[PDB]
Paper text:
Exo-β-mannosidases, hydrolysing non-reducing terminal β-d-mannopyranosidic linkages, are widely distributed carbohydrate-degrading enzymes. All of these exo-β-mannosidases process their substrate using a stereochemically retaining double displacement mechanism that is characterised by the formation of a covalent glycosyl enzyme intermediate (GEI). We show that these probes covalently label exo-β-mannosidases from GH families 2, 5, and 164. Structural studies of the resulting complexes support a canonical mechanism-based mode of action in which the active site nucleophile attacks the pseudoanomeric centre to form a stable ester linkage, mimicking the glycosyl enzyme intermediate.
BsGH164 did not react with N-octylazido aziridine 3, but was labelled by both epoxide 1 (76% inhibition) and aziridine 2 (30% inhibition). Both complexes have the ligand in the same position, sharing a 4C1/E5 conformation as observed for the complex with 2FMan (ESI Fig. 4†).5 H260 shows a slight displacement in the complex with compound 2. The structure presents no obvious basis for the lack of reactivity with compound 3 as the pocket is quite open around the aziridine nitrogen. Our structural work shows that the epoxide and aziridine inhibitors bind BsGH164 in the same conformation found as 2FMan and that the N-alkyl aziridine binds to CmMan5A in the expected OS2-like conformation of the GH5 exo-β-mannosidase GEI.
Author numbering:
A (entry chain DDD): 31 to 682
B (entry chain AAA): 21 to 681
C (entry chain CCC): 32 to 682
Write the structure that this text describes.
């Protein structure tokens, strides 16, 4: 069996949806067109329901037929473990219902892995489709018992060391361990019968469900990390014209989770929402190209579309498909085929992509999400007083930097390497990360002391990991920030922070923060209040502005001032060595990468007008390698059309 | 035959030749005085109303010892008889005071026995009054909240499932849904109403049996009218402006009432029908879309129903309830027990009937030959696919009824009659469908059996117009668009894609720079036998298939819903007229062009043709009437309408009846 | 000391005590509180922070706070707050079980026996914020109490005439249940302490007044309190009318108190981060506005929640008057100016009596209960929703506030109907949809004896059993000299245009038409009878059955309601009471007396400087208090946006 690595040739692929009633002729037509569309890979849901017989034996014939037709057309298979479940369950169950159900799953894995491991075109086991859910089954006996046991094996006090009341987030910490346990158990079950094939899983809805996911632990039992990134389910925090930024952030979040493992996008939107989806669309040909290039530029080893062909009955019947109802290519399959073709014509370049890290990392943590859920009591009013502000704030910084043509990491705090000796020219952004503990504050102190730049806005560090506010009891970040909060005062959803000397008018959301400096240099507003500071801490710097300016940019639909302020704070080396825009461009993105020593840039225009983007930083002259609407450059000034995707190769 | 007439006895038996009546609920509860009740019947008689409806509350007849005391209702029946008023009597067993509408099914076997006792006592006693006109078996059968929680319903559903044999796969092997709940609910309504009819018939074989289905644009998926015909003498209805017409603005409650009348008329088949429950007065705290009907609306509603073959209009209510829910609400009389402008208006229509008995007793709607068809299964599949979302678009509950109602409105604004029928109420057995038209607008579920009926209809000369997602699914929510399109033969074409767009977009045709409003989804197709119609992007968006002697126009984008969303039915009117057989436009009075917020429907009585015209626009309108034969004589006009040679000048809110000389 | 109507008013604040705090921090709070001219604190006596593993009471945490209070001469309102979940911000409202009741008995014995011995204890707060919108009918203690209550009451399903009725068993039980538990808490305290004032803070009064029988509570309290939070309780108003909200809230509690002194136990002292329904941080200007409104309405105190903040989870670092460095915010600086004014003006400030115009706006429990039945709990913000029966009288209250006229805001049973003469008195019944025969006889007596009755909206449409006498035989026909004909629903906002006086009154939702017998009819420009004036003995009735107070609310314009109401007031009210020469949008005035001297409070909530011409009563304006340099010329006051002014009337 071929094993995926960081040097593998990336593929374009699609789900092949197999259910009873389909003909041999139909299935062959799908694999034939898939191969002709420069796709090398499919994913097949190994439905337990469609292998169980009246007598209780396993009949594999429906899936044998599909695997053999895949093999005939040289198509490799991602096989999803999908035990018997109700027909109406579109995504699959996330945990066993009962001990008896766990034994049924054991039997399912034994039978399916023992049989299908023998196909030479099997590429990977997907341990479970879309682990995690917003509706965790605390009602069910299996989960209820595991939670009770977990609480008894943990030793939590109702008071902290100083004597203050605390919350312990038992449910949230259990759910992390429970996901770790079930996925590790699935991996162990597969490994009883198959030690040869890659193990894979697709975390999903990552801007909501990241607080369920411990990716560093998952690395210990996976060969590759996957993902679902659907425009109609996962990108609700963005308008459609910023699905570029959404896909880039989603790719960066999975890339960070993968660490040293290769990653790929297991499940992308291939087609139309009729009745399905939260934010329904039919992707354009232009969007298909945008999403494949964004993922490959972010080190993806594959993009698999849900779905090649459609389900026929009830939920999503005739929805999501890349082929039309005559089983011929839509403009989406034609577009995807151009990217498969580009890969086959550019194998060495496309097999060795490394993202060009600017040195900017936007960090989120589980605990800011968990504390926010407790403090907002689950309200969904779309503001800072609602679920989602702790992810929308860092995503807004991410957007501002994308609109400056700067790459940024999007990482859980535990995925950041705090162990190095030197952080000169590195930048951490902590945007409205409302919960930080003493351990992470020491890591941030070390980072800044060793030359790091820390940017913090909104309610970053207002609470610890027990929802205890050190702002009230004795501020844990006083040392690092060289300053102390004074007040928060609630204002309107959108207000202006007007700096002394007109240096900036920053859009701000909901709360105005005021501070008192000791060691830091104060920054005053036109009302004579202290609204920000710069602290020199060892060899590094802190910029702290306790009003939500990233959320202010989001609310005002204008990232230009956040871009300008952030650029002014970046170490010179980042702007000298990284291709970026000469200024902020609304609804344009760029991210750069390297392959075998050569530098490349990806540029996408999501504005309504032709844009001329002046690219500066790094070295070399633009050669346009890919441009789907005949972009042209004059010196390093790129003229790019609405919805166009461009790859520049930088020569000498 | 002559055995039915010996059974009939002294009691009136309603027929398609009965003189229509205007009537009102007489609300009887304890605490009212003899003098008050007499005042109501006296004013009802003086208002040219011949008929009342009375709720025979079990609660107000049950005594401490469990005997029935009939005194309260005897008093009312005797005062009705004194003023020559006939009574529709509603069976309404003991129930909580707070239950405004009544329970829809028994709670338990024990409760069923209490209902049996109630029917025995009440029917045995009140059947003896010579002024009893009908038994209403149950008030407003059906509900949006069916009691699956209660033991009687839970057990009936379990038994039903055991007596049906469903597979999880179809003949070709594909997964299926069987809609067990929905099919049970049809059979459950059939069972309980048939049981109530059988219970009444134990004690009274003389009097008409009646029932009032309600909220028909939402609850039609509960109702099997063809089966109900087997135990009713007349079909009724509730059609309340404040409860049932939420899919329409108030200025189109004309169209809402016309469609509601057409839906019940279709359900009635060979039975006579009447409107059992119309809104007679004001909403204070009650209703979803609260109003107080204008005098003009009362006249509009009575004429629309009569023009659609109604044998009566009964207003809820003559007098008001006094305590809690609807206290001092809904009444046609004011708090001094005198006439509101609504009762004065209703009285003019009672007077017209007495002065025009032979005309008004023999109304037959002039069928254009256009039938707008809905089916239970499109509603059931929509409820499964939208997961019950209430966002008011194609991705929500209601689109499968709003789409056909939009075609209905376009035709109303062209002055053309159209039937509104459940697919099983359409007669597919004829040899010739020349000059007949079926509109299937976003009827998302069609099975092989109905497709064969449609093939036969078109082959034999029928015109079929299909828009939106018509035929996307079968009756098991299986999409033949995915597995092998069941309408390919009839349509001479095959779907290619749907692509979701905004709530309102334009279909921009290749030719004439022609534009159609469309809702939510753009459909593209590939033609084999059909003639393709292309858009400016070079995609095929519609086709005409010539199939035997008939034709099919198929446009798989929702253009009826596009007209609804744009609040403009003018293009849908023009397109539909262009597809009609010439004989329909030659033989039927209609407007020379589309008129926004005007309606006309035509009818015949004893060989003479008539037209009803209502102006709901803000301005005086001059409507040029063409088609059929004759010269306009204005027989009814409440605001001094005048005509010059078939051009009618009609005022805002005016109702006009033209007699064609 | 024992509170009385002659006590010197205080400014005070919650001192929030929880484990983890240092001696040094707590001392810093009491020191700054004393330096801020505050004499009083309130402390939540958390059972959770006194219970030991063995079940003994350890009082240490609260001893430390009481001793530091005493050192700085700060008196303590001590809230009885038995052991409860850390997540319970407000406290439980009733015992969960008989066993829980015994735990509460033990808690009261221990806490009252111990803390009664501190010389700086001022009052026991029997329970924090009695009442809740979500009553625990599910729990055994309440389930049993409701069963017993129903067995001891005998309700019929029909009235005397034979009509069906509702009996509102749940609502009547809840009144008796609140009365019982608060009386029981008072009796428990009195087992161990007969020396200290008993106090309680009813809250969210524009929603929860239907839970509260203040006349009964007087029998076991020494003072009535209140919570009046801008972020929880004033949702029926925009922020610019929180002046009117606070004035009405003060008037409602003042009416409930009767002969007892009252004070505001719980005002908003600081910022909402994640908490509150209508979140804000009060301005310095709002702090001053709220203290003066309450004192002008006879309040003996204003206590802010909170001096210092909670540290963990719910409201962590929220609500506090001090900043995160434990120094004064502009809110504490503002409150300190009012504490200073009181110390410099003790005799004036100790003897405030509100100058009653003679106008009383009456609400009743039963209108709220019948509305909840008729609207089925709908929250659509119109007359067909929960709240219209309180928003209607509050709208009249606002119209009068914008005329500079004081008005009482009273439950109907708090009005004294026993007097011989009501000459120059006015009752306004605005959309009080339920009235019974007993209250109608009291209103007949009131009008006969010289009273003026103003009724709008659906006042008297129903009786106390939700039976409409409008349907069966109108109970108010005698008093009104007229009979309803119809209601017809219209749009959310329409205009009632009088034939004669060219009043054009905004009206909400329903148009009422009537027929006059003895009354003089008032016709509109459509030729319909929409109102009447009935002469009844020495008094008069103005009846307009369309909602004109709710019309003013919906149009955001109280000017026409002001003009119409002024035209109906007895001359003596306009001659003897300071008021505005005309309607002023977003300005309020209320007047008071102390030791024979008359004063006026004026607040400008408009965006612009206003010049208000004050007329009525006697004397020349002297500005005694002004936070933005107001000036007067004769009796014409120039007042800045957000400014609070006290005029002393000299002659
Ligand atoms: O909703 C479309 C897709 C997506 O959710 C993924 C996976 O869950 C697949 O089963 C669904 O059909
Ligand atoms: O809501 C008004 C009417 C209507 O529902 C019909 C019937 O149910 C009657 O009982 C109601 O009073
Ligand atoms: O929410 C703010 C306040 C207020 O409700 C009062 C009291 O209940 C206190 O406990 C709260 O902290
Ligand atoms: Cl799968
Ligand atoms: Cl009835
Ligand atoms: Cl407290």
């Amino acid at each position: 069996a071929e094993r995926i690595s960081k040097q593998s040739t990336p593929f374009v692929g699609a789900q092949i949806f197999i259910e009873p009633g389909q003909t041999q002729e139909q299935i062959e037509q799908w694999f034939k067109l898939l191969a002709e569309s420069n796709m090398t890979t499919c994913r097949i849901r190994m439905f337990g329901k469609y292998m169980k017989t009246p007598s209780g034996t396993y009949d594999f014939t429906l899936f044998d037929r599909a695997f053999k037709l895949a093999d005939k057309y040289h198509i490799k298979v991602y096989a999803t473990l999908f035990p018997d479940t109700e027909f109406t369950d579109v995504g699959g169950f996330k945990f066993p219902h009962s001990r008896e159900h766990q034994k049924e799953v054991e039997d399912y894995i034994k039978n399916v892995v023992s049989h299908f491991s023998q196909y030479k075109n099997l590429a990977a086991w997907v341990l479970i489709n879309e682990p995690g859910t917003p509706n965790l089954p605390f009602n069910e006996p299996f989960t209820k018992e595991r939670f009770s046991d977990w609480k008894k094996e943990h030793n939590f006090s109702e008071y902290n060391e100083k004597g203050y009341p605390v919350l312990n987030f038992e449910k949230e910490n259990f759910i992390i361990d429970y996901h770790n346990w079930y996925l590790n158990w699935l991996a162990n079950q597969v490994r009883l019968y198959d030690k040869q094939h890659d193990l894979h899983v697709n975390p999903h809805n990552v801007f909501k469900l990241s607080g369920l996911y411990d990716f560093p632990t998952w690395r210990t039992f996976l060969n590759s990390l996957g993902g679902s990134a659907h425009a109609s389910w996962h990108f609700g925090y963005f308008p459609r014209k910023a699905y570029t930024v959404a896909m880039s952030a989603n790719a960066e979040l999975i890339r960070s989770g993968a660490g040293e493992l290769p990653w790929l996008m297991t499940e992308l939107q291939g087609g139309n929402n009729l009745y399905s989806g939260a934010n329904p669309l039919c992707p354009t040909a232009e969007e298909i190209i945008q999403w494949l290039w964004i993922n490959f530029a972010t080190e993806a080893k594959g993009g698999i579309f849900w779905s090649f062909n459609a389900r026929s009955t009830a939920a999503e019947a005739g929805e999501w498909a890349m082929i039309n109802f005559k089983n011929k290519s839509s403009d989406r399959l034609i577009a995807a085929a151009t990217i498969g073709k580009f890969i086959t014509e550019n194998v060495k370049m496309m097999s060795n992509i490394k993202t060009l890290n600017s040195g900017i990392s936007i960090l989120y943590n589980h605990e800011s999400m968990w504390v926010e859920a407790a403090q907002t009591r689950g309200k969904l009013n779309g503001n800072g007083r609602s679920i989602g502000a702790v992810m929308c704030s860092p995503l807004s910084y991410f957007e501002a930097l994308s609109e400056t043509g700067l790459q940024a990491n999007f990482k859980e705090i535990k995925e950041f390497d705090f162990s190095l000796n030197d952080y000169t020219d590195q930048v951490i952004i902590l945007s409205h990360q409302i919960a930080l503990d003493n351990k992470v504050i020491k890591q941030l102190e070390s980072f800044v002391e060793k030359g790091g730049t820390l940017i913090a806005d909104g309610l970053t560090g207002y609470y610890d990991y027990q929802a205890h506010s050190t702002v009230v009891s004795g501020f844990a970040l006083e040392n690092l920030f060289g300053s102390y909060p004074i007040e928060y005062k609630i204002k309107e959803n959108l207000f202006s922070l007007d700096f002394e000397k007109d240096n900036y008018k920053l859009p701000a959301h909901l709360w105005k923060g005021t501070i008192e400096t000791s060691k830091a240099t104060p920054i005053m507003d036109k009302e004579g209040e202290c609204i920000a500071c710069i602290n020199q801490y060892g060899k590094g710097k802190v910029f702290w502005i306790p009003s939500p300016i990233a959320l202010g940019a989001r609310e005002s639909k204008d990232f230009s001032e956040l871009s300008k302020l952030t650029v002014s704070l970046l170490p010179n080396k980042i702007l000298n060595d990284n291709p970026h825009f000469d200024k902020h461009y609304k609804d344009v993105m760029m991210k750069s990468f390297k392959s075998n020593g050569t530098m490349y840039s990806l540029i996408i225009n999501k504005s309504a007008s032709v844009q001329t983007v002046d690219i500066v930083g790094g070295k070399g002259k633009a050669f346009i390698l890919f441009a789907n609407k005949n972009a042209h450059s004059t010196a390093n000034k790129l003229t790019i059309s609405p919805e166009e995707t461009v790859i520049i190769k930088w020569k000498n």
